[PDB]
Amino acid sequence: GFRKMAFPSGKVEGCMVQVTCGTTTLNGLWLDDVVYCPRHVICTSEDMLNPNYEDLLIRKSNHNFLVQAGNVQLRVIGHSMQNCVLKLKVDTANPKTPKYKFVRIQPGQTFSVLACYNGSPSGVYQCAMRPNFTIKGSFLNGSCGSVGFNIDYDCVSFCYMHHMELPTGVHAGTDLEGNFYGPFVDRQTAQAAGTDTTITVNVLAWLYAAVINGDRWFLNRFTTTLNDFNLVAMKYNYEPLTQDHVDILGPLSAQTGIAVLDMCASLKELLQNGMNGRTILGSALLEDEFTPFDVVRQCSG
């Protein structure tokens, strides 16, 4: 009884618009009198090979941007490039603008993606920022400008805008100031994300979710120290566990009466021994896209 869960998307649906420029169309994020979208909307197909964005944007004028909010065209009255995102000022402020902010997330953190096409939402799902600054998403052509987000209190925290796919099938994009996550560039060339690693603190969170849900075959008598556990995790390309990670997991430990280091001994066993064909929360693998926060939010409402 523990699912991958996304935040309600309603506050965000009313921010999505359609942005066209030439024959390239993608999604924009309409907040106040500004629409944010990926700058590569100004590229033809030839340009994407090795674009000079400054030069390409000079040749553009306000009226080359067809922005549609539903059955309504909005008039573009300005434009700037901020790193890899375009900001088209518009003559209408979005009445559906929520309380919001822009954040740059840390690797290991999760967020919800509102996948859109032609400015219309099709679906929402939960993602993690991988340690190598990619996300394993579900993105097709036209999905660029779709945004990732958290909701905390009344406040929408925008943290991602989608730009590209990499040869491994994973995805890359920017924060809402246009700075990529990771070493990527918005040009059409094969690019390497580097070795991904497993988010150890999230796997321990998911094991606590498993215990909280009456699924505890993997517990043992033993224990370990942070040092000895990291000796093992390195071998399997797990992020090393800090003490801050132990204190993050404190509340989950409190709810289960299982000390973090005791749980680490259980994970050490699972990595060295494998699942043996058993399952954990209906999964035949170890799951690393739940933060401790996500587990608390779900397991206590």
Added chain:
Amino acid sequence: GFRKMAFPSGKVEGCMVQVTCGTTTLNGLWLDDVVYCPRHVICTSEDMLNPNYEDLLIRKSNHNFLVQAGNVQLRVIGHSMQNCVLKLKVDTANPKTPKYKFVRIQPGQTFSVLACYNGSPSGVYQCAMRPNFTIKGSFLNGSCGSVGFNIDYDCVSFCYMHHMELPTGVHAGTDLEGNFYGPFVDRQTAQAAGTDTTITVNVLAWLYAAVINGDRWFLNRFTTTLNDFNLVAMKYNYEPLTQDHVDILGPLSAQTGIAVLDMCASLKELLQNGMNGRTILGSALLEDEFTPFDVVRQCS
């Protein structure tokens, strides 16, 4: 590159309200001037062992029902029971009422769940109605009255409202007329869902999703017959495959140039041989909560 994906939840968020009767509080669904919620909101803790709902409801009047859409208190002017759901007529039509219908989904079909607590949405995810009429959700106390739904065009089809958990951890509830999916009753007694079965057509659809996403290690040079494949499906508690299933899968067979019966052969072998430790779309198991429809809509 293929994820479980829920519909956008905005049209439904604006329908969720808080229903209180006594000390019991759960969620209701506000459409036009009617709030729908589970009838066990009128139960105390004692009553839940074996309630006489007709008798329990007599003792209630309109003013025993507190309804709040956010901070807005709605005044209840009428109450009726329809099967296992209460309808509270209220003095205000919901300005955010979407285009909606009520439908009763078939097993093997999927829908999105807007999990709510105290009339406020906390999250959304995708579910399937299992063959044994249960769903594998994430519901805690206070989650009753949360609804499951599909969106086609601008039209919200409401198909589920949540009522209870079974001892196995799976979940049971009603359509929006209050008729349970499955043999269940809204009383706090042990209740059996019976042997679950695997939604064969959905597994085939997911294997097609896999091939569309560059993952074909499981394909083979063998083939098989409908009748031959089903002999093996019985063994493993799989719904049998009809030719309707074959035709529903027609669009996916096209897109990949793999014939359904060839895929049935690859599936037969996975059932017989196992996954040999490998994976398909990042799962070490066979997934059966994607309809052919879901796979199409995602991959195109």
